Amino acid sequence: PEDPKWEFPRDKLTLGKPLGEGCFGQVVMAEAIGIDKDRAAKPVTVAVKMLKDDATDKDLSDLVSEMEMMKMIGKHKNIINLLGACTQGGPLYVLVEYAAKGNLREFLRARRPPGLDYSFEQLTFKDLVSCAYQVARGMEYLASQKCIHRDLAARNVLVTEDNVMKIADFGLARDVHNLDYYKKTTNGRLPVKWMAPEALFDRVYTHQSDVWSFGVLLWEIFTLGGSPYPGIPVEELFKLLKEGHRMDKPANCTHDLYMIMRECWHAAPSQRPTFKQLVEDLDRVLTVT
Ligand SMILES: COc1cc(CCc2cnc(Nc3ccc(N4CCC(N5CCN(C)CC5)CC4)c(OC)c3)nc2)cc(OC)c1
Description:
Distance between the termini: 51 Å
Radius of gyration: 20 Å
Strand content: 15-25%
Helix content: 25-40%
Strand order of the largest sheet: 1-2-3-5-4
Family: Belongs to the protein kinase superfamily. Tyr protein kinase family. Fibroblast growth factor receptor subfamily.
Binding site for ATP: 19-27, 49
Structural class: alpha+beta
Active site: 151 (proton acceptor)
Bound molecules: the ligand COc1cc(CCc2cnc(Nc3ccc(N4CCC(N5CCN(C)CC5)CC4)c(OC)c3)nc2)cc(OC)c1
Order of helices and strands: EEEHEEHHEEEEEHEHHHH
Shape: globular
Oligomer: monomer
Number of helices: 8
Organism: Homo sapiens
CATH superfamily of the largest domain: Transferase(Phosphotransferase) domain 1
Cytoplasmic side: 13-289
Number of strands: 11
CATH topology of the largest domain: Transferase(Phosphotransferase), domain 1
């Protein structure tokens, strides 16, 4: 179906180097001429999501679905924003802002201290708290647009040239304008190590399950992109979650942040803070630093 305000001229777009592939799409760099409606002459670097070479019928509806979620949500400094789409007379391309510094996971990994006898700017504690705050701000806006992410992890935050956090990947994102929750009812491919028990066991999704994931992102930030539950099979995760295991506090983490972290990991969804609260919380910490 047509949507002319979002539609983009195909001949103004030149596809470039791959950025990586996901579940139902692949991403490439591209040049889009006159994407900046204030400098209609000059080519802008954008990202383009399109179907993969082995794409199913469902992949196509999933990608259209993700494009609609973005149009819905609206613009925010801490969310990756929709720029346009070629939807008519050719393969679906979705045009999206390009984050120059990749995803946060690799970002953090790439700037760990090398070691005394090793090598090939530096991050500070305040930098890490800033990242957490920005993400919290974007999730706060996301939640107030009556939408659930369902895939919040360091790999799904992208970092611009200016070190701005941008939430990405509306692959599992769901509109909850109605009931204000989501029930999966079906089996699927799930980011299991980031997911709250109620979501994992009982398949119930809320802003509050997103909060749990955000807790895990916190852990990822302060370990500078550590993997939760490394090489642990799903059955063991289940066991450890049922048993009430929580992750240990990272070295680079203060007590204050570990409390905000554990707070996100209350068994009862209702006992967890909201994104709004989390912003306040991280604002305070950002201040004392
Ligand atoms: C709803 O949210 C979204 C989000 C997007 C992602 C839109 C988007 C996606 N990516 C980027 N930037 C970017 C920049 C760099 C890299 N890399 C650079 C280092 C590389 N490295 C070198 C050696 N080796 C080959 C592997 C490791 C590979 C990764 C990268 O990989 C992730 C990504 N900006 C925007 C699209 C979308 O379409 C609907 C919707």
